[PDB]
Ligand binder design. Structure first.
Ligand SMILES: *[C@@H]1O[C@H](CO)[C@@H](O)[C@H](O)[C@H]1NC(C)=O
Ligand SMILES: *[C@@H]1O[C@H](CO)[C@@H](O)[C@H](O)[C@H]1NC(C)=O
Ligand SMILES: *[C@@H]1O[C@H](CO)[C@@H](O)[C@H](O)[C@H]1NC(C)=O
Ligand SMILES: *[C@@H]1O[C@H](CO)[C@@H](O)[C@H](O)[C@H]1NC(C)=O
Ligand SMILES: *[C@@H]1O[C@H](CO)[C@@H](O)[C@H](O)[C@H]1NC(C)=O
Ligand SMILES: *[C@@H]1O[C@H](CO)[C@@H](O)[C@H](O)[C@H]1NC(C)=O
Ligand SMILES: *[C@@H]1O[C@H](CO)[C@@H](O)[C@H](O)[C@H]1NC(C)=O
Lengths: 201, 595
């Protein structure tokens, strides 16, 4: 029982920079034996919820396609990263399917992402003409027309730039603090390639 | 259409949260360390915040209020659509701001000079207030009192007149009959199926409720007069108005400083536990933690980490000037804090409960949309803070938390001393608030001609309050402007309405708590039913009519005095026998300068 490639989860979770939620990252995971128990028992997450296979039961399965979606959101938006949810993020920045097979993991990054004077680097979409499909990413930035008068790509009465920044500051209360979110999406497809849990003696 | 306004308010709330936070944080920084740098930063943040509000109130006019059916949009938008003083021409606007700053300046440079040694000047804060609170020399008290109306009062008179005119033009431009009518809009409710309230009803309710409490006041007056005559013999008439300068302060607003002369049973000890705090080595943290427990015990949330980590709970670390005057803060973005340079004393114990009560109200409505994040009306915020303090003060509480000895014997005489102190603090101020607002409203409405302003003031102080000012001042004076709120543009009626809301709340919650005795012996800290009952209202902010907020907490759609009377009924019962051998009420023909 030797140790093989375990997949670069370190680059998923303890990555330096995270994406804006409106333009979330999509990272492919493959060709390895991945231990998920070690994320669960790290006790380093505020949120660790599965809609699919339990956090330590993932270790008894093989998947062919594992994807890690990642981004930064406000703490009060953490509850929206789930199947069946609606809201500013769930409706048009990032949406999980009602039949999602994976797990959503999140943690407080106030000491990493908040800045004195305000961290305005992270963006979310405030407006979209329609809601996103599950796992859809839309990073187009035309000026959003709210009114009936045709808007010629110019901010004005009833016409708004669709993306707005956050303003993360060290003394924001909980819920206005930034959170780093990783979503692990699991698929079983048909290819000579897997992501497996560990062998037991 | 509502749809476009909805989109707009969502966009507005996303901007407003950040700019308000920057401004609030800049003001906070100033208040914890007074220095020019922080002044410059709060002033700059304040100006871009006002500029933002003006740009948004301009955009807001393109969303006709009448097309919006939902209240959360209609109310937030109506709040944003007010044009304020922008309705005034550029010259009238800058002139009014100049006047307001000038009036604040005259009051603020609050000094008078003593003819005994003209180069020696007194300030209002130390000095004149110290004389009015502690000296028993009729003549010293009289000079100090007059010197404030002369000097500061007289200097303000010509500004006050221009002020009234400019404010009425502004109010009319915004479709109010006058500025008093503008202020009364804070209690106005419309289009809510019976929870509606017309601005003119504030006057009817204030006048009605006032008449109903006069008997408590008349007996308090007679009792106090009987006692002050032994401090100021010859000077006070047995059947008259008390001279204004003999009431304990510069305006005759509180009768609290007279307590030491009027103490019912001077042979009995008080419940001032400060010595216990000293023997038990309590510090500021203990004081705030006991206050936190009060709130936790009733079912309210605990304080946030930001509160415990960032608050100025003690004197500043270096020899710094800071605004130590106690106050709660809400910066936006869930950042809650307090400023209070706490000393180990019962007064700060009670203050900590008062301000934390304000924080709990701010936390409860934190989830409301930004323009609705305030109390139901101007008197609600303080009414909540006052009930938390009132409960913390009872001997029942104090002995239960190990602060007052468990062997303390509370009896009839103790209860009376307690209630009189409270009456001097509460009952004795209602006619002041009532009289002042009634007078200012008549001034703003144009009912009192500019050359009859002091004439009416003096007559009303004798007929309503029962106090006679010792000097027959001319119309060159503006004695009401000698008070902070009058010269600095504040409404005052909030104190009248707050007091009555306070007692209605205390009664409703003591009933929820199943208290079995009189209201002054009530402690609701162990009642989670009372906690939830109040909470359900606190969480609403301004999203609902204040009249509904009262139905939810007290079972009423309006204010009442019966709970005030019930709180003090046993004091009253006692006063009724104390005055059986004397005149109750007062004559207004007598004055201390009559001859
Ligand atoms: C977390 O950070 C630590 C730092 O040593 C690193 O070793 C680890 O691989 C990172 N990632 C995870 C998923 O623990
Ligand atoms: C004084 O206010 C300034 C604002 O820059 C702050 O940086 C400084 O630490 C404060 N001084 C003290 C002694 O708190
Ligand atoms: C106000 O907004 C709320 C949002 O849930 C909506 O339910 C309510 O119906 C709106 N008011 C009216 C009168 O439509
Ligand atoms: C303020 O709003 C009112 C609402 O009708 C409008 O009539 C008035 O002209 C506006 N004033 C300014 C200064 O924009
Ligand atoms: C607040 O947190 C403290 C931490 O121990 C807890 O003991 C207390 O009961 C909490 N209060 C509430 C209302 O949850
Ligand atoms: C003391 O208690 C007795 C009980 O009968 C009561 O009659 C008496 O009036 C009380 N004393 C005072 C000052 O109220
Ligand atoms: C009421 O006081 C008792 C006295 O110890 C205390 O134990 C109890 O916890 C208090 N009630 C609540 C809800 O904390």
């Amino acid at each position: 029982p030797n140790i093989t490639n375990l997949c670069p989860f370190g680059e998923v979770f303890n990555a330096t920079r995270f994406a804006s939620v409106y333009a979330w990252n999509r990272k492919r995971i493959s060709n390895c034996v991945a231990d998920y128990s070690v994320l669960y028992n790290s006790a380093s997450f505020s949120t660790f919820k599965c809609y699919g296979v339990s956090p330590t039961k993932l270790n008894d399965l093989c998947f062919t396609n594992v994807y890690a979606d990642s981004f930064v959101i406000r703490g009060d938006e953490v509850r929206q990263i789930a199947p069946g949810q609606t809201g500013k993020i769930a409706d048009y920045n990032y949406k999980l399917p009602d039949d999602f097979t994976g797990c959503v993991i999140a943690w407080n990054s106030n000491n990493l992402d908040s800045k004195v004077g305000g961290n305005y680097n992270y963006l979310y979409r405030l407006f979209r003409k329609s809601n996103l499909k599950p796992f859809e990413r839309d990073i187009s930035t035309e000026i959003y027309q709210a009114g009936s008068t045709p808007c010629n790509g110019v901010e004005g009465f009833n016409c708004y730039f669709p993306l707005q920044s956050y303003g993360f500051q060290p003394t924001n209360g909980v819920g206005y603090q930034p959170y780093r979110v990783v979503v692990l999406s699991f698929e079983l497809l048909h290819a000579p390639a897997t992501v497996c849990g560990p062998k037991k003696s | 259409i509502e749809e476009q306004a909805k989109t707009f308010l969502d966009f507005f709330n996303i901007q407003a949260e950040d700019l308000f936070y920057q401004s609030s944080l800049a003001s906070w920084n100033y208040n914890t360390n007074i220095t020019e740098e922080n002044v410059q930063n709060m002033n700059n943040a304040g100006d871009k915040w006002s500029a933002f509000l003006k740009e948004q109130s301009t955009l807001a006019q393109m969303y006709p209020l009448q097309e919006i059916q939902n209240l959360t949009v209609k109310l937030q938008l109506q709040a944003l659509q007010q044009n304020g003083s922008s309705v005034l021409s550029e010259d009238k606007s800058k002139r009014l701001n100049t006047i307001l700053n000038t009036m604040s300046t005259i009051y603020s440079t609050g000094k008078v000079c003593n003819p005994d040694n003209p180069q020696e000047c007194l300030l209002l804060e130390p000095g004149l207030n110290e004389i009015m609170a502690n000296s028993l020399d009729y003549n010293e008290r009289l000079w100090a009192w007059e010197s404030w109306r002369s000097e500061v009062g007289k200097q303000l008179r010509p500004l006050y007149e221009e002020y009234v005119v400019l404010k009425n033009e502004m109010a009319r431009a915004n479709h109010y009959e006058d500025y008093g009518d503008y202020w009364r809009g804070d209690y106005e409710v419309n289009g809510v199926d019976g929870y509606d309230y017309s601005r003119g009803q504030l006057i009817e309710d204030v006048e009605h409720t006032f008449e109903e409490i006069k008997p408590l006041y008349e007996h308090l007056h007679a009792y106090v007069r009987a006692k002050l005559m032994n401090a100021y013999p010859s000077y006070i008439s047995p059947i008259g108005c008390l001279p204004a300068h003999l009431l304990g302060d510069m305006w005759g607003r509180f009768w609290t400083n007279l307590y030491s002369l009027t103490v019912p049973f001077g042979q009995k000890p008080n419940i001032d536990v400060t010595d216990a705090m000293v023997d038990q080595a309590w510090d500021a943290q203990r004081i705030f933690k006991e206050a936190e427990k009060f709130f936790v015990s009733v079912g309210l949330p605990n304080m946030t980490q930001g509160f415990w980590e960032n608050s100025m709970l003690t004197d500043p670390g270096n020899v710094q000037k800071a605004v130590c005057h106690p106050t709660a803060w809400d910066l936006g973005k869930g950042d809650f804090r307090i400023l209070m340079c706490t000393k180990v004393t019962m007064d700060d114990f009670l203050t900590a409960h008062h301000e934390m009560g304000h924080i709990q109200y701010d936390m409860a409505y934190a989830a409301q949309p930004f323009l609705l994040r305030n109390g139901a009306n101007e008197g609600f915020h303080e009414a909540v803070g006052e009930i938390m303090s009132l409960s913390a003060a009872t001997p029942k509480h104090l002995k239960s938390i190990g602060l007052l000895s468990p062997d303390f014997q509370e009896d009839n005489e103790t209860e009376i001393n307690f209630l009189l102190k409270q009456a001097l603090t509460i009952v004795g101020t209602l006619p002041f608030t009532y009289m002042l607002e009634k007078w200012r409203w008549m001034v703003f409405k144009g009912e009192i001609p500019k050359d009859q302003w002091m004439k009416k003031w003096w007559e009303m102080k004798r007929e309503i309050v029962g106090v006679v000012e010792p000097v027959p001042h001319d119309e060159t004076y503006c004695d009401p402007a000698s008070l902070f709120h009058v010269s600095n543009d504040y409404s005052f009626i909030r104190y009248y309405t707050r007091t009555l809301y306070q007692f209605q709340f205390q009664e409703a919650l003591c009933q929820a708590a199943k208290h079995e005795g009189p209201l002054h012996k009530c402690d609701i800290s162990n009642s989670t039913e009372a906690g939830q009952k109040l909470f359900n209202m606190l969480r609403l902010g301004k999203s609902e009519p204040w009249t509904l907020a009262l139905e939810n907490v007290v079972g009423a759609k309006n204010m009442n005095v019966r709970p005030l009377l019930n709180y003090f009924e046993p004091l009253f019962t006692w006063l009724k026998d104390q005055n059986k051998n004397s005149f109750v009420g007062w004559s207004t023909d007598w004055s201390p300068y009559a001859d």
